[PDB]
């Protein structure tokens with residue numbers, strides 16, 4: 001649960017992402033894959049990437065970063081009223097991709113890391129607080145659907 005002022009901060013931060021969605025998406029995925037190499041094993045189309053240089057050179061990885069962040073941005077713009085947008089993603093991630101909730105924690109922290117790396121000094125403490133709360137809400141509503149499905 002976020003206040004109106006917290007949602008305003010989230011959507012202000014998101015404007016930074018929307019100026020370069022592919023560059024942000026690329027770096028988020030690279031941070032996830034390099035920090036948590038077991039996550040790479042869930043992607044049949046990226047498991048061939050052995051080095052970060054290969055990851056950086058991959059145009060398909062940048063494409064997937066655009067898909068991921070476009071979906072998250074659509075959810076964030078609903079300011080919590082995201083049941084219809086979140087349900088298919090929870091279902092596909094539990095039943096088809098088999099993504100444990102832990103990996104959604106990993107990517108949440110990676111988004112925070114990337115924002116500080118690309119906007120040092122311009123991602124303030126209030127903005128970090130509000131973005132963190134928004135990613136927690138996203139993760140928590142996915143977790144409720146995971147429990148319904150019995151997925152661990």
Ligand code: HEM
Nearest residue numbers: 039042043045067068071072088089092097099103104107
């Ligand atoms: C911010 C969180 C994330 C969002 C919004 C997101 C969004 C999406 C979307 C929109 C798709 C394509 C449609 C679909 O299959 O449902 C996708 C595919 C996928 N997601 Fe996620 N995702 C997230 C986190 C993750 C994480 C943490 C993992 C794995 C560690 C992951 C693994 C996958 C896989 C394996 C695919 C299929 C890729 C393919 O082979 O083309 N997702 N995701």
